[PDB]
């Protein structure tokens with residue numbers, strides 16, 4: 650799916666230029682703020698749900714993140730916790746617990762949630 | 763009826779609180795099984811229907827004894843756990 654991200658980001662920039670030149674702005678200082686105004690004026694959909702309105706955005710905000718390749722071309726997996734089926738979770742867990750242990754050997758309402 | 767009166771099943775209220783002394787006597791009879799016997803003996807209960815009672819009671823007593831023991835044995839490990847979030 651990564652080839653899709655390369656391609657999409659390329660075409661996104663080419664279409665970005667294409668947008669600026671017709672909309673008649675400097676392609677350099679063009680922002681998302683300007684992207685919105687632009688499409689909103691070109692394809693004016695009265696629609697209540699705002700996700701179903703036209704979008705041109707950087708594919709990263711469009712597409713979901715992906716889980717990277719989890720094993721080498723030998724079949725052998727990179728992370729040692731892979732077989733847990735959640736490596737992402739238990740890595741945080743291993744690290745957290747490690748932090749704790751080290752703290753125990755060493756040691757001898759701001760609106761924050 | 764041939765025995766001297768007032769020696770049996772008698773509490774004497776202390777510091778004039780009656781309700782307390784009655785609770786006390788009640789605890790006596792119920793500790794010895796006399797209340798369950800009065801209540802048992804209001805009507806009859808036939809011999810078979812009695813061994814059934816006996817056996818159900820005694821099974822149930824065995825179960826509750828064992829389960830009690832097991833609970834009070836595992837009691838220690840109720841203590842807040844050391845290894846959390848390993």
Ligand SMILES: [Mg+2]
Nearest residue numbers: 763764765767
């Ligand atoms: Mg008489």
Ligand SMILES: [Mg+2]
Nearest residue numbers: 795798816819
């Ligand atoms: Mg009995």
